[PDB]
Symmetry: D2
């Protein structure tokens, strides 16, 4: 039960976003949610989707995580509008198709670094600014994938950005631990989202989960949200620096 | 929210058992609990500890996991008495002191296999029998420690039994996944229990968590309990084959 | 260059055995070799295979690793016959077909412990006895499979026994390290051997390596033997408690 | 024996460099070596160092890996001067001292992207340019540290860059495996080098290996060079996507 709790959810674009699975769940557990977005199109989609939520106010902030000022100022504005928060859910990542859809060895410098910037470094600077609204401690959760841990066909530069994200979680864990800020990741299974369209062979990835994963079925966004609720709440008070695979068991097999 | 759920908890000896932290947690969440014990002295503690629970009936079964017949019969009687169950918490391990307290390379054959039998194999046969009471699916959780993944000073033969246990979890996950039974581990941080007195150096293991783990404190039985509730509930539906470290972040650092 | 080195190689059964690939390599590199076997039939193969090698003397010993007396007297005879040694290549596993070719949850207690005994515990007692003949230090290597790190269909009880072995290596590396005894594993890809016939679906496992492993081919016994030469020699002087995958890269992908 | 082999060694700074240990070993084994260096003002010192080797001529190229042009043009010149190569030892990394010595949460975007640039991305562009000189296959090795697998105090931004590097190696291995190019990492224990002065608490780190690693000693640059010889030669055919810890076993303990 997350009554009197407040969470910042970053990275909803539409109803299929993993972040929206998080939000339906936290919303049904009673949490007050605040939302961040990059594109105005996503804000419009948040205004719509909010009609399905209990949230009695829209708290929507534009934060492009590529800009120090937008992050610095977004979170500072949040602290002034709703006060102290209990956690962040980070569900942001990006890489160019042009790098994604070529040989990994052909990845461009700017594409590699763009993927690092949005997909990894964004969590560090969000943590630093969000720390400022958690004087009592809290919980930060980032969304990753099995491609950070193993080379997965066609995931390429985003795989290296995920490996980077996952180490980011650990180093943030050790750093903000003494402040009672826990930092963790959910390694979600593949899930048809707007961004899934960027991954070559994604239909064959889906199929292979069903055929080979222990539960012999794919996961959904609500399943990610149910584990986010665990990590973002007191239930997981002794868990930081961890990576939970919400993935039907597929991480455990070969 | 486990009203109308039933969980079999194996391995309570006294008030400081990890499994008793699992029990107070699931008891407060509204679960019906069934307890298994080995020694008569443990059943005596269980009858006492039940007075602190909300459980309106004592369901207590002697099950020494060295005995196929006792596991087989124990569980069949559980099903005759309370019907189908939603899960099992496994909190059972054993090795001889004489093996634990010598050089690992001096470990006896009989003591090595003893520690495999009670501390690993017992999971497999418990799953097999518990599966008969979970026709519609469920959740099995075992307790491990970090010495199953890395060589920890003085954990010796139990280290290899926990490596085995952790592989047992994954192979059980892949085998019983199709029946909608999930199987996971909790890697608990060090916690003062009756069995902790078996581990050479345990006070220095304690202190080292506090000074080096991200959270700079040790965990307790309730914290393991809260992660058990998550794992034993529908909040962790897409999660199987997993190993959650309830250990203040210690697994993540070096 | 391994002239004036002596290595004990355990577990050749015929020309296909992984250990005979190791032998050919160590033999081509100049090492003196001592062989142990279980079955009469394997001693006859050894006698025949020795004509293909450069060894001027045949040093063959019957050691059934289920017997402490055979391991203890085996290595002691070895000391009397050839003197101090530089290392041991261990290449021994067994599980019942009846357990392997059924569901893992259905594994018998005696089959599980049988598999631990031959396939894991054997390394501990071998290390203890070989250590007596390595007063200046040396190197011990064991043969593992990826299914000790992940659940692989049909590997079943042997996957739990390899998980046990792999931990065994790490605890022994720690225990014996001050004695300048290094202990490592090689995780070999699937290879056609007499024992590969016990694992259901082997050919499917072969094909999937060709299809999906980075090198898009299978490895062979000589490739394992060349990595053994590295681990058994001074080239690997800083390396212990390690698991080297000689599997065309299959361990790094998913 | 590496006669009629040619290797490019990137990252010799002085006689304490891990890349110079690599050079000594490979030089001793009869390889032709080519050296790359960052700044023209330290060509004269590198030339003096290499008088120690049995190289008949200096093959020295200035390549700063922050520039694609320098990498592209450097490897093209090497091809014209020397012909086809058999592999590359990558020993390059960099982070700001100013990001190294703060809270990891306080890392600047510029400093976090620079470390990724020099310490991870450089491997990718190097492999792409070196692959042009390895039409029949070959071997690429990069140097990482345990800090990329766990959070290590004071390693901060470099730890996340090594996590990146380590995934880089996995993705490169999958990409390039069909070309018969293998890509691996050596994870070196702590070694007193020019760059080690930049890590806070280095001697404490030394002392900890001495005290806690299985071998109870530190490793040296020549021990890295010997694992490098194995990884760069045919002894390691079948090994790719791998991370060999040359660290006295410290990685396997906790
Ligand atoms: N779908 C899967 O199978 C899968 C699996 C595992 C992990 N994940 C991870 O889950 C997370 C979310 O992806 P998803 O599948 O839910 O896709 P999604 O619905 O497309 O969401 C991705 C979000 O990233 C945001 N974003 C990108 N760059 C940004 C920037 N510079 N500043 C602010 N926001 C930015 C997008 O916002 P705008 O549209 O407003 O630009 C969008 O809301 C990512 O971390 C992804 O890697 C996905
Ligand atoms: N305490 C820690 O720091 C720690 C840390 C990580 C993981 N763990 C793990 O947590 C679990 C629980 O142990 P604990 O530390 O809570 O100690 P505990 O209170 O001493 O419980 C150990 C339990 O194991 C039971 N057991 C031993 N052999 C058995 C058998 N043959 N049949 C049935 N039960 C048997 C004992 O029952 P009887 O007394 O009736 O014989 C006792 O209930 C173990 O798996 C342990 O390895 C503990
Ligand atoms: N083939 C693969 O795909 C593969 C892959 C990864 C790992 N491995 C591992 O590689 C090792 C060798 O297997 P292999 O494939 O080379 O098959 P193999 O030729 O059939 O050799 C297995 C050996 O185990 C010996 N052995 C079994 N029980 C023994 C006992 N109780 N005492 C002494 N020796 C005993 C057998 O000796 P006797 O015949 O005399 O009884 C036989 O020589 C094993 O550890 C295996 O698990 C194999
Ligand atoms: N020392 C250790 O304990 C240790 C442990 C594990 C891993 N490692 C790794 O081993 C590798 C070598 O480090 P080291 O300890 O040998 O230190 P080092 O001798 O100082 O070598 C680092 C080298 O990287 C070069 N470099 C930095 N930026 C470059 C650039 N932009 N372009 C081309 N070269 C560049 C440096 O060149 P300049 O001198 O001209 O600036 C220097 O030659 C690094 O990857 C390091 O992370 C070191
Ligand atoms: C394969 C499962 C999977 C993993 C993901 O990280 C994923 O998310 C993204 C992938 C690529 C981009 N991009 O190109 O900007 C963006 C995102 Cl948010 C989607 C997935 F379907
Ligand atoms: C080091 C943290 C820790 C890990 C454990 O597995 C643990 O449990 C046991 C240890 C030894 C035995 N035995 O010898 O019978 C039994 C158990 Cl239940 C206690 C711990 F203190
Ligand atoms: C799948 C790759 C693979 C891994 C192995 O461990 C392997 O070795 C054995 C497998 C089964 C038994 N047995 O049942 O007695 C014995 C051995 Cl020696 C063979 C393999 F083909
Ligand atoms: C602590 C072990 C250790 C790991 C390393 O990667 C290492 O190398 C570097 C560290 C920092 C920088 N820098 O800030 O530019 C550069 C390098 Cl080359 C040295 C080490 F002493
Ligand atoms: N191969 C096509 C289709 C992928 C799919 O199977 O979903 C692509 O790269 O998008
Ligand atoms: N070293 C003592 C005491 C351990 C402790 O509690 O610190 C022992 O072997 O039990
Ligand atoms: N699947 C058959 C054939 C084995 C193989 O495919 O190699 C079996 O159970 O043995």
């Amino acid at each position: 039960n997350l009554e009197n709790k407040t969470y910042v959810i970053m990275g909803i674009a539409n109803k299929r976003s993993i972040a929206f699975g998080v939000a339906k769940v936290l919303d049904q557990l009673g949490a007050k949610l605040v939302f961040t977005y990059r594109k105005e199109r996503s804000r419009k989609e948040l205004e719509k989707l909010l009609e399905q939520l209990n949230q009695p106010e829209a708290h929507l902030y534009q934060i492009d995580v590529q800009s120090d000022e937008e992050v610095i100022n977004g979170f500072e504005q949040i602290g002034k509008d709703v006060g102290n928060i209990d956690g962040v859910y980070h569900s942001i990542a990006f890489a160019n198709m042009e790098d994604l859809r070529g040989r990994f060895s052909e990845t461009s410098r700017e594409g590699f670094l763009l993927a690092q910037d949005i997909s990894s470094y964004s969590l560090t600077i969000v943590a630093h600014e969000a720390k400022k609204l958690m004087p009592e401690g809290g919980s930060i959760v980032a969304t990753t994938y099995l491609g950070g841990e193993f080379a997965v066909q066609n995931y390429n530069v985003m795989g290296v950005a995920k490996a980077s994200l996952e180490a980011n979680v650990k180093y943030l864990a050790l750093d903000l631990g003494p402040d009672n800020i826990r930092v963790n990741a959910i390694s979600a299974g593949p899930i048809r989202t707007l961004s899934a369209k960027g991954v070559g062979g994604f239909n064959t990835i889906l199929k292979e989960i069903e055929e080979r994963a222990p539960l012999k079925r794919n996961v959904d966004q609500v399943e990610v949200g149910k584990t986010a609720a665990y990590l973002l709440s007191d239930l997981s008070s002794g868990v930081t620096g961890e990576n939970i695979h919400v993935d039907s068991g597929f991480h455990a097999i070969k």
